[PDB]
Chain length 472, copies 4
């Protein structure tokens, strides 16, 4: 006789699996007690989480609204239709001119499905170089010829770079490379670029070379929705994105695409219309994915309602103000940040004038509950180790921090790199020598204590600190 539904199927997690419950509670405390500066990280809302953890996971719904493979989809269809319509609203798109597919499981699935829809295998693609701040999904191969990204495995990629002196995208060199290489797809957007993008110039270049133009706005999508960044939809054919990061939603992806008549073009028929919609939907399903994750789609619909509010626009402004305040604090102490400022959510800190690598600063910061990541500076790939760190404002801004709180984060960071220099001075630059300073270091222990006391004093979206298992 089967174990009754009430026993295996309705009992709470704490009773069914205490081991996993305890680990989630330790993770909740860790999220409270640290300074989260990873620029792709955020803390999403309880309401998002409630839709994410729901019976929507129980429904297979292959196809799209109106064109499903089987039945029972009356309410899945309303949810997905509402999610699509809220996505277009949040990004201020006319539905007569733009559509969206909200089924991609995450950002990288969204990008590969866009490529699969738009290109043939082996077609040429250009994206921002990884050491210049691009993302793996935009193409990456090593100097030894090893194809790392599946984009470089299944297509033919060539990167473009920032100017090695200024840290800005070298638009003239990109134009020159694209005229030589003739990509079928030109990608803009990136993961570690501290300035806004000139989409109008990308459109000029794409038109010269005959390329499709795609923007991957994953890192900045919250700023785009809030009209706190340049609008890629004004110039790009397709726009991909994650829904987490600065949009503060669940982990998922979206693909936006143009619809309707095409703008006037050289020697090509009158009345021509875009033909992206069917290709993109078909690439997502049946080509690449299986059943949608309807709980993710439901949670995304919640996130998009939350993003299309006056409150979210104030958040987006504060994210930017906090990044500027942190960058200015660091610069005031003599530190050097790439381009000497920022226009978005992140700062790139050049550690070479300190004689440090980002590997050392990242390792020491992680030991005092500050999470950031090493990052190449000025597009360099010849340095043994990356010469900088990337630091982002979205996550701590979501916990209510404002400029003065980010200036205190700046001083914690200044303390961290001072300790890092102290270790390197005492023990040396070699990592097995540097590691000697990371154990039994009372100054490091004290910085960890200060960081955790600071972090633990702010609110937290998504769960109630007052009810968590580990409150200290």
């Amino acid at each position: 006789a089967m174990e009754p539904v009430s026993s295996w199927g309705n009992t709470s997690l704490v009773s069914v699996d205490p081991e996993i419950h305890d680990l989630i509670e330790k993770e909740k405390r860790r999220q409270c007690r640290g300074i989260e500066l990873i620029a792709s990280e955020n803390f999403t809302s309880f309401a998002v989480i409630e839709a994410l953890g729901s019976a929507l996971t129980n429904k297979y719904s292959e196809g799209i609204p109106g064109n499903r493979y089987y039945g029972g989809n009356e309410f899945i269809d309303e949810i997905e239709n509402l999610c699509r319509s809220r996505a277009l609203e949040a990004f201020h798109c006319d539905p007569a001119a733009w559509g969206v597919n909200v089924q991609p499981y995450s950002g990288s699935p969204a990008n590969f499905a866009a490529y699969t829809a738009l290109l043939q295998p082996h077609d040429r693609i250009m994206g921002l170089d990884l050491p210049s701040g691009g993302h793996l999904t935009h193409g990456y191969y090593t100097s030894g010829g090893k194809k790392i990204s599946a984009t470089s495995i299944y297509f033919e990629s060539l990167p473009y770079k920032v100017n090695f002196t200024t840290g800005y995208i070298d638009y003239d060199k990109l134009e020159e490379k694209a005229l030589d290489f003739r990509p079928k797809l030109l990608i803009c957007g990136g993961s570690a670029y501290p300035r806004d993008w000139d989409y109008a110039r990308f459109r000029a270049i794409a038109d010269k070379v005959g390329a499709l133009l795609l923007c991957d706005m994953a890192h900045i999508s919250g700023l785009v929705a809030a009209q706190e960044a340049a609008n890629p939809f004004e110039y790009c054919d397709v726009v991909t994105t994650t829904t987490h990061k600065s949009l503060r939603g669940p982990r998922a992806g979206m693909i936006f695409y143009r619809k309707g008549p095409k703008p006037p073009k050289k020697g090509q028929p009158e009345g021509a219309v875009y033909d992206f919609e069917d290709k993109i939907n078909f690439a997502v399903f049946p080509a690449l994915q299986g059943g949608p994750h309807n709980h993710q789609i439901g949670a995304l619909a919640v996130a998009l309602k939350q993003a299309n509010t006056p409150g979210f626009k104030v958040y987006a402004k504060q994210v930017k103000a906090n990044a500027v305040a942190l960058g200015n604090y660091l610069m005031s102490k003599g530190y050097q940040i790439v381009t000497n400022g920022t226009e978005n959510h992140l700062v790139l800190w050049d550690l070479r004038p300190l004689g440090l690598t980002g590997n050392k600063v990242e390792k020491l910061c992680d030991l005092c509950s500050i999470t950031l990541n090493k990052n190449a500076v000025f597009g360099d790939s010849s340095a043994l180790a990356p010469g900088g760190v990337r630091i982002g404002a979205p996550a701590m801004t979501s916990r209510g921090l404002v400029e003065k709180d980010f200036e205190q984060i700046g001083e914690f960071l200044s303390r961290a790199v001072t300790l890092t220099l102290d270790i390197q001075k005492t023990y040396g630059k070699l990592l097995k020598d540097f590691n000697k300073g990371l154990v039994n270091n009372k100054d490091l222990d004290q910085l960890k204590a200060d960081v955790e006391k600071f972090s633990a004093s702010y609110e937290m979206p998504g769960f109630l600190m007052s009810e968590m298992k580990y409150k200290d």
Copy 2:
């Protein structure tokens, strides 16, 4: 001034987004007031759902445990390590001989990651034909040459088929085709095959052509774990799977791969070891995916603990017994099911002797709250419309139903097919004429009321019916 954190960030869904809360409540009612017979569907536990909706969604953890790109992953690592060890335990794998990657976002990403790891672009692949019960991810192109599956877009696929007459896999024709085509990868496993798989013969055939052998056990993984189906790990190089369907977990995928010393093969260096682990891990990340969905991984760990219990084995046996009881009931009424029985969780009902297409039955059933799906029968890819339906036992067995209950489902299905025949008699075979009978049909109305009364009488996992909005 920013909105307080508590306002946007801690308020419940019912208050933040009443529209979406209301649609989830309507869907909750729909799930426990219908007869869910879609063979890939199941109803997972509240414990899984609680880990799924958790703060684990807030952590980026690119890499694998012990080799992460970022810091702060001390507890993510413990969760993923526990998930991996529980997956190996559920499927009775020696960790010295098998590893697993639990990051694939779903079943289809798991398969494409496995192909990326093991194959070069345009390498040849063979899998069960979609009309014979295979899955899209095993390859599919149309008679017109259109490449539908990404597997057929980026690789070179060729399907193998069931026997036209018996409905069993034709292993002799498969071996003949594999000798001619010389796949680099032979895929076993399927989505609509009602019998178990001769893995030993797949290994014999793979060895004759020097192919890798992969089993996609997505549909039967719960039966495999409970040792209620033959074990593909005994013979396959790699096993991919979903974690929902018969395994009753979250939507996610896993890739299992051999590790350690290889068994003897002529032309193989003494001491040779498998080299799958690094290639599979690398294909998942950095090649294809980005950050893992750690809430899925935590929820999967819960599901794998629940699966590795005596209770789950009782469930898996009951799923099979319910599928048999339903198949036997239909055959007792004179209906025809493919291979005249089943060895797993599903039954294929051949509707051709009735003069009915699968879509007519699927449509009428959906209007009386019975969800199944049309399905080709005996590998047929000529017929205008599929000639059968596929019915699965996992989801309703999860609501506590046993053989007698599945015999009542059988009577509901008999009534549905009778009503379909009645409409076809009166309005005709053209779908545009048939549809006229689906409106203002008092027989159809009554069948729906009966089905929903029936479905209402059983328990429901994952949420409390006593708390739902629409009772």
Copy 3:
């Protein structure tokens, strides 16, 4: 000062390069003192050879008539236009329905240019399996997965086979395979098939799968021109060929292609015309080849004028009659030939009922001035060594031999096989042991003397035996 023009530039070969002159003279003697049974070989006319060795080699003429890259092509254009129209005439083609490109350097270039014109890289192709009598250029990979043919390197091939019992093409199994594999191109034609081809059935199969249909008629082109074989042009979209072999011309290739209105079809616009011409021309140049070999094209024009005569049809009839006579002779001695006959220029002799490999017979025959070649039988690839030999009539028919002379060739072959059996009896079946009987063998010596006396008694086209350096 430079060497005077008349010294290096006008002096005869005999004086400029006595070493090569001597070698050509030894090869001329070899050609008219042996029995040439290689089914792909012929002996061409002096008039072809005079055009082949001419000042036409000095002219670069990239492009096609009416559309060259260079000037100075007035007379080259006239020659190439003549050659094209003579090609269409020789194969009874309406020039409104068919065109031809005569620039391919040889047969294998003609095939690859056709694939490049018609297909995308990695498209699927089906041709007759090499062990079933197909050609390497139709696709060939080993059981170990080694891609041997460029066709299998750059495209995706799958072969079809003869019936393993009867030796005929298994058309039902071909249709079954084509429906599964769905090639974009189906190839017919072969190098070692003793029967004619059911082109109507290939067309029915190609239409069922939507394939283009190509005939590589290289081996039988002279028979086709003479209307002594079924006409591939009635059913195939494209026909490729060598111009040597049974057509008796220089070594070159041609690609014929349909032009003008298409036959009725589903989903095809009314008034649709074939679109092969520009693609095939462009594939030959600029895609694959460089300057045409105008001496080849001039020599080909001569051969096509010679092929379109009553006398050539009599020759083609005689070729067939001689192959049948030889096959009948062998069968009357108890030997076995595949399909128990022939309908074209060649015979496939099954040596397995004699306990012999084709390798042994080919080697002993070669030492006795009989040239043929080993060949698989009944499509077998599992054997160690091929179990048969292929024998063709075109070359010795060109020296004037008729049925009774080919029956004498049969008796030489019987003697050769009897000698091979005697050697195998004395020295063994292992090839290394067998070879011991091929040195200082009195009966081998005698058979060689008799073969060469026989061969020397016939006329020889292409050069004057009365003027050659080595007459005895």
Copy 4:
């Protein structure tokens, strides 16, 4: 009842095919009554032509010497062995360190076989841009992305260019592009570059990216053999070539390749040996070609003996001296040539200061029996039409012309461009209007008469003007 062998088979071309005989005679007169300035053109010897037009055309010899598929090859083997040894000797190669395959049907087949042997489909290749003086076989795709060369269809090509100001190869931009693109094969060699090549620098660049280094020496091979050009074999892995053009042989190709121990390198296993020989032979046959053209191989053997003489070195010196004399003559009259000189067999004349396109000069020259061709200048591809012409010295040098005679060619070319300007002045720059001056133009008729009288005063290799049908 066959036609007698002597009738179709031994009768002379003049009797068998008067139409073709007549056209070859017209082409013979055209060759020795005009000024041949096509830099890829030459006039080969009668001795070469005698081997080219010979019974060697009758022999199938698939395989290589010592590894043939069937028999009868005793003398074909001696010829091909002698051809290969004479090729290595003419290019001063140690046969322990270099091998050669002499079967490629022409230059473009030689290149594609080398690519098939060395590379996988879609591998990256870099070669000199067509507008910068490269060859189609090195890669070519249009600005619209149309893949023109098979090299660009089956592989992934990217060109490098000359400096737009100086006309020399821009080695710095080449190294920059190779570092970004990471080709598997770097190609040097070209069709319209007037300076020598820095092979040592190409090797430095190839080593930085791990590429193979191939030289296509087709245009300069006679200079390389004569040690009148830098030696590509010192630095390249593989060298391909035509055998016509400056080497003055038949139309054929060769692939040379290193063998034996590899030179020391970092990360290179000790004792490493080259692995090209089998891959290249196998690519030529069976992968790409069928039977060798043994008449081309014999004619090539002749040409290689003629090339390895002191007389040929004086020819190569004179070719270069004649190109310099012509370039200096044009510069003395105020014309501009690219790089202000030449180091090889050709000159590039920049017509832009005159307001002329090469199209107009080439067409007017063709009308007065001067054959040259238009050519892009300084790597420009933006012009509506090329701004230069390319002029080569090999063909007229082979008819015995020396510096004084090339200065008369220079004055003839000055007269041609002066008349071209006259037509343009009176009718206009639109080629539609320009053509109005090319008919019934008295100065144009007189220049033609002066050119043909001059040309008739020189000797002619390959045939006897005293025996030709169409004398003056």
